[PDB]
C-alpha cells in the first residue's frame, strides 16, 4: 500500500491444509519493511 | 577559431591563486517523498524512578 509516499510491507507465513480456494481461519499480517519510495505504481504484474 | 576545451595549469611552484583547490557542493533536493537523509542523532542516559 502507499500512504503519503511510504510503501507498508506486510507478510504474514503460516502452513496450511488447503486442497483448493482458501480455508477457513483468522491471521494477523506483521509488517516487513516501510519504503519511503513515493513514486506512482498503477498497475502490476507476476514474476515468471 | 579556438578550442573550447582547455586543460588546468595546476603546478606545486605557483602560488595560493593557481593553486588547485576541491570543491565539493552539496545539492540538496525537496520533493513530495520522504527525506531518507538527515544528519546525525544524538542520544542520553536513561533515569528510571
Request: proline share 9%; with cysteine.
Amino acid at each position: 500500500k502507499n500512504i503519503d509516499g511510504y510503501f507498508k510491507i506486510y507478510s504474514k507465513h503460516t502452513p496450511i491444509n488447503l486442497v483448493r480456494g482458501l480455508p477457513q481461519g483468522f491471521s494477523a499480517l506483521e509488517p516487513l519493511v516501510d519504503l519511503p519510495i513515493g513514486i506512482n505504481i498503477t498497475r502490476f504484474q507476476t514474476l515468471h | 577559431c579556438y578550442f573550447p576545451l582547455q586543460s588546468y595549469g595546476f603546478q606545486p611552484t605557483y602560488g595560493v591563486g593557481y593553486q588547485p583547490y576541491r570543491v565539493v557542493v552539496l545539492s540538496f533536493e525537496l520533493l513530495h517523498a520522504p527525506a531518507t537523509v538527515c544528519g546525525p542523532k544524538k542520544s542520553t542516559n536513561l533515569v528510571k524512578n
